[PDB]
Design a protein around this ligand. Structure first.
Ligand code: A1AR9
Ligand code: A1AR9
Lengths: 306, 306
């Protein structure tokens, strides 16, 4: 028992992390087979990063302008190209540590692990959710650009995120690994801002089921509610609508605890109208929304990865 | 910016994790050079685990009774011995993935990363603190025994914890890697229980400094307090005393934010007497005590490991 924000073991990703330097800009790259992936703004200068024409900037570059360090070993760049907002640096050595991998794009509400890196060196690992407004509430300092987010499915790494920039509220924006930004953000210095967020309702319900599995029951009740009536309360509290498919996805957790999904909706209703009255749930005094139903089942059942 | 519960990259530990089976008991072992370390209760049966004489149980065992699987490769056991509450299984192959390492024992109030494992396969990584009552609030299911906790210092892994058991409140107890239990717990089935805990005051102050670094300032004030007067409030709220050495350790964070340590104590005082009045700090509605001053400086400055 117990319930923690759990990341995937990071080893398979650590073996892919490299340092990419262009001019005076150093950031992180992701090295798979014979290609290094990194944010294309590596080729921009201070004044470039205002309003740049990336095609123009790249044609002025040569292979030898890109310095790639795999630990203390230098990788020779033999080709370069742009794909949307990422660069693809062709190197003359395939990474012997390349795991089985995929490039997937995730949905807001889903989670992933982040391996924060600086100068190609892994610093720490933590779990994030893609917010409904397509930002992530990460932990990133200067030089973290190119750090990646990922999930692990048995032995296969699904890369879903590469870090690009911090927004003025301190939240973070990035792309999938085909270089397509999550949300309405661009790799230019504009006045872009996050835009309004909501709470991931299905995840909050999953987390209440984690609590019940772990012995927190004070918020349960005998009342029930309809889906339509619950969603009227969700709207008034900036929670997003609950679908029948969310209800179906919560089926297994429902069946394990014996608490009907709409019953737990009734409990969430009361928590929203009454607050928590000085009590806690799974060591939180807030309703937590960054665990998916998948995350609860994995942790409250115990699936591994090899 | 941003502040997350961050674990160390787990790769160096993942390469050491193995499966140890004795009879019908399977748990995890830690494989370094030619020795596998694991909880000695692996040699106990159901009825053994009531009140066992471990010396008696071990003399009845042979090398071939211990099955060790390093992934899909079987390691031949060539020697076995007890050291306090751990077994040391001598195998005929030195682990080629052995990192530079140390066996350290940590202090309550300090943090470490846990690589939760099942059947020798890494499942997930997360950050824990050693509680003042020598328990950890982990996330562990059946078969996690032998999972380890660790810190990373440049390239050196300091192992500080091996998991043994869950206590009736759902918290967790274990040993250092010389097999000496943290706190007054034994690897027998007794009515042992955690015993009263307190809040790690210096860590809460460190976390308030993380908040100020990250733009949360609503809890600051102009008042100050003396150390003696702060500690009178700490006692009334089950917070442990603050020492001059805690004040000294908070010096750098103080100097970076320009908020005197005793000033921040005054702020913590008010938070304890008034609560948080529907506001949050670093996305928490509770005063958080599982980040050391070291953790805040590492994350709010950006140190890596290689
Ligand atoms: C990479 F340089 C980097 O990690 N940056 C970063 C990322 N996350 C947090 C923080 Cl505090 C810093 C970074 C540094 C300078 C500029 C930029 C940037 C500005 C505009 C547009 C884009 Cl795509 C990046 C990011
Ligand atoms: C290893 F078997 C194991 O991981 N156990 C465990 C650990 N943490 C949480 C949970 Cl839910 C289970 C475990 C399983 C059965 C018995 C014991 C045990 C009982 C008494 C004394 C000791 Cl040292 C261990 C632990």
């Amino acid at each position: 028992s117990g319930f923690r924000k759990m990341a995937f073991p990071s080893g398979k990703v650590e073996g892919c992390m490299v340092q990419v330097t262009c001019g005076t800009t150093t950031l992180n790259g992701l090295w798979l087979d014979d290609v290094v992936y990194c944010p294309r703004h590596v080729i921009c200068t201070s004044e470039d990063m205002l309003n740049p024409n990336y095609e123009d900037l790249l044609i002025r570059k040569s292979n030898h302008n890109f310095l790639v360090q795999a630990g203390n070993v230098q990788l020779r760049v033999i080709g370069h190209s742009m794909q949307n907002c990422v660069l693809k640096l062709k190197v003359d050595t395939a990474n012997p540590k390349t795991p089985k991998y995929k490039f997937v794009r995730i949905q807001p509400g889903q989670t992933f692990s982040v391996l924060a890196c600086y100068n190609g060196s892994p610093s720490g690992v933590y779990q994030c959710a893609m917010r409904p407004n397509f930002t992530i509430k990460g932990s990133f300092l200067n030089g973290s650009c190119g750090s990646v987010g990922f999930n692990i499915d048995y032995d296969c790494v699904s890369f879903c995120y590469m870090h690009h920039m911090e927004l003025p509220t301190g939240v973070h924006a990035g792309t999938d690994l085909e270089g397509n930004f999550y949300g309405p953000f661009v790799d230019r210095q504009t006045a872009q801002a996050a835009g309004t967020d909501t709470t991931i309702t299905v995840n909050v319900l999953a987390w209440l089921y984690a609590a019940v599995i772990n012995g927190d029951r004070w918020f349960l009740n005998r009342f029930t509610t309809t889906l339509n009536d619950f969603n009227l309360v969700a709207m008034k509290y900036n929670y997003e609508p609950l679908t029948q498919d969310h209800v179906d996805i919560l089926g297994p957790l429902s069946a394990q605890t014996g608490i009907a999904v709409l019953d737990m909706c009734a409990s969430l209703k009361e928590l929203l109208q009454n607050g928590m009255n000085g009590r806690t749930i799974l060591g939180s005094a807030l309703l937590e929304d960054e665990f998916t139903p998948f995350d609860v089942v994995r942790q409250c059942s115990g699936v591994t990865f090899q």
